C-alpha cells in the first residue's frame, strides 16, 4: 500500500513567530464566541508574559437582576466613597478576566493553517489559559473589614514575597482591543501566507535514519566504566568494539581449547584480513592433527599454580606440553600410563585429556573431531615450522 493520495506540500512562516499567542476559555463551550462583546481594555506584562482583559456586559436585560446588581455594587466599592471605584455606575456593567501560564517552553508547539494544497506553520510565543476574576468578593470583604477597623540574615530565598516583588517590578502594558470582525484581522492574517515556490529541497533534514536515531536518543553515559580488554565478563557474539584483531583472537581462544579456523570469519566478520589473522594465529595457537590449539604459555600466565583443589604445585607447563607432543607424534593417546610416562599423578593430567579427547572403554582417549582440510590453504611452511617447534620441545623433554 503506497502513499497514493493527498500529497499536500508544507510551508513555514516566521513573520508572526514572536506575535502568536494562544488563548482559550475552558469555561466557554465552543458553541458561542465573544464576537458581540466589546473588550474595554486590554493589558500585557511582556516580561514573563501574562495577560489581563476587561470587557462590557449588558445590564437592562431580563437575565440581569438589576436589584441584586445595585445591592452588590454598593458593597464591592465604597458605598458612597469610590476611592478606588471599579464601577462609576451603580451597576455591574463590566467584567474582568485573568490568565494563567500553561507551560515553561512553547518551542515544541506551533500554529498550523490549512489551505487547499498548502500548509503554513508558525511557532507560538506563548499559551495562556483564561480565568474569570472572582476578586470583587475579595474587595467587598476588604471594604467591610476596613470599615470595621544591620538587620539579621535570613533563609527565605524561596519566598512568595520575593517572587511577587519580581512580578510587581514589571508594570502593565496596555493595548487597544480590536475584534475578529475588524478587517485588521484578515489584513494581518495574510502575513502567515509565506512567499515561496511550491517545493524546493530543504537545506536541513539531511541526516540518515540511523544518524537521526543516534542523536535523537543519545547515550546517557558518555564514558564507559571499564575497558573492552575484558576486565570483566563481556559479550562474545557482539564483536568487541575497538579491540585489535590480534587480541580478539586471544579473547576467543581463551574460551575454546582447539578450533579449526574455517569458522572464525563468522565471528570477526567476513571483512577480516585473512593474511593478518594467519599471521596472528601463530602467536597464540599451534597446530596438531589439522587443528589450531591454544598455546599453554598464554593459557597459564607465569605466576600460575596448581589451581584445582588437589596437590599444590608450581607452573609446570612441561607436562601439558608433553601430552600435546604425544598427540602430535601418535594418532591418539591409546594408553592410560601417560601420567606415569612423565611421572605425573592422575589429577595432574586428567583435566587436559578432557580438553580435547573423549574416552573409549579400557582403551583410553581420542580427539572429539577428525583431521580437517587445512591443506586446502597453501602454506606448507607452517607444518615444517611447527616441526622445528616439536623438535625443540622434544629435545627438552628427552632430558627426562
Amino acid at each position: 500500500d503506497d502513499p497514493v493520495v493527498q500529497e499536500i506540500d508544507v510551508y513555514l512562516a516566521k513573520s508572526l513567530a514572536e506575535k502568536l499567542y494562544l488563548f482559550q476559555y475552558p469555561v466557554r463551550p465552543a458553541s458561542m464566541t465573544y464576537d458581540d462583546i466589546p473588550h474595554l481594555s486590554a493589558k500585557i506584562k511582556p516580561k514573563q508574559q501574562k495577560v489581563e482583559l476587561e470587557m462590557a456586559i449588558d445590564t437592562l436585560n431580563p437575565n440581569y437582576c438589576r436589584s441584586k446588581g445595585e445591592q452588590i455594587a454598593l458593597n464591592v466599592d465604597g458605598a458612597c466613597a469610590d476611592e478606588t471605584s471599579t464601577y462609576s455606575s451603580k451597576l455591574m456593567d463590566k467584567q474582568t478576566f485573568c490568565s494563567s501560564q500553561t507551560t515553561s517552553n512553547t518551542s515544541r508547539y506551533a500554529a498550523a493553517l490549512y489551505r487547499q494544497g498548502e500548509l503554513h506553520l508558525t511557532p507560538l510565543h506563548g499559551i495562556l489559559q483564561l480565568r474569570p476574576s472572582f476578586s470583587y468578593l475579595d474587595k467587598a470583604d476588604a471594604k467591610h473589614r476596613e470599615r470595621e477597623a544591620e538587620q539579621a540574615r535570613q533563609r527565605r530565598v524561596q519566598s512568595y514575597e520575593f517572587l511577587q516583588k519580581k512580578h510587581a517590578e514589571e508594570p502593565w502594558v496596555h493595548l487597544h482591543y480590536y475584534g475578529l470582525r475588524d478587517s485588521r484581522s484578515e489584513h494581518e492574517r495574510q502575513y502567515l501566507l509565506c512567499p515561496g515556490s511550491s517545493g524546493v529541497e530543504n537545506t536541513e533534514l539531511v541526516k540518515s535514519p540511523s544518524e537521526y536515531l543516534m542523536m535523537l536518543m543519545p547515550p546517557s553515559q558518555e564514558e564507559e566504566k571499564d575497558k573492552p580488554v575484558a576486565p570483566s565478563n563481556v559479550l562474545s557474539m557482539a564483536q568487541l568494539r575497538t579491540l585489535p584483531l590480534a587480541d580478539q583472537i586471544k579473547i576467543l581462544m581463551k574460551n575454546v581449547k582447539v578450533m579449526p579456523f574455517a569458522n572464525l570469519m563468522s565471528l570477526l566478520g567476513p571483512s577480516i584480513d585473512s593474511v593478518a589473522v594467519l599471521r596472528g594465529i601463530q602467536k597464540v595457537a599451534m597446530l596438531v592433527q589439522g587443528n589450531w590449539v591454544v598455546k599453554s604459555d598464554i593459557l597459564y600466565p607465569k605466576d600460575s599454580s596448581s589451581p584445582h583443589s588437589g596437590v599444590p604445585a608450581e607452573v609446570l607447563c612441561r607436562g601439558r606440553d608433553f601430552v600435546m607432543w604425544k598427540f602430535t607424534q601418535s594418532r591418539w593417546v591409546v594408553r592410560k600410563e601417560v601420567a606415569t610416562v612423565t611421572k605425573l599423578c592422575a589429577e595432574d593430567v586428567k583435566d587436559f585429556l578432557e580438553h580435547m579427547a573423549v574416552v573409549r572403554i579400557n582403551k583410553g582417549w581420542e580427539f572429539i573431531l577428525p583431521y580437517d582440510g587445512e591443506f586446502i590453504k597453501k602454506h606448507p611452511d607452517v607444518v615444517q615450522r611447527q616441526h622445528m617447534l616439536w623438535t625443540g620441545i622434544q629435545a627438552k623433554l628427552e632430558k627426562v
Binding site: 469555561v27 451597576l91 472572582f134
Partner: protein
C-alpha cells in the same frame, strides 16, 4: 442534575421568583427565570423475579 452560571461559572440555585420562580447566581447578577415545565428522570430498580414468582 447540576447547573452552572454562564455569568461566573458557579452552580445555579433556585430562588423565590417574583412572578415566576428562578435560578439565580449566588454572587453575580446573572439570573434565569423558569418558563417551561421540567422534570428529571430517576427510574429506580424493582424486585427480582425468583422469589416474586416462586411460591405464587
Amino acid at each position: 442534575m447540576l447547573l452552572f452560571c454562564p455569568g461566573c461559572g458557579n452552580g445555579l440555585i433556585v430562588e423565590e421568583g417574583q412572578r415566576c420562580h428562578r435560578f439565580s447566581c449566588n454572587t453575580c447578577p446573572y439570573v434565569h427565570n423558569i418558563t417551561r415545565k421540567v422534570t428529571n428522570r430517576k427510574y429506580p430498580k424493582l424486585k427480582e423475579v425468583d422469589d416474586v414468582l416462586g411460591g405464587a
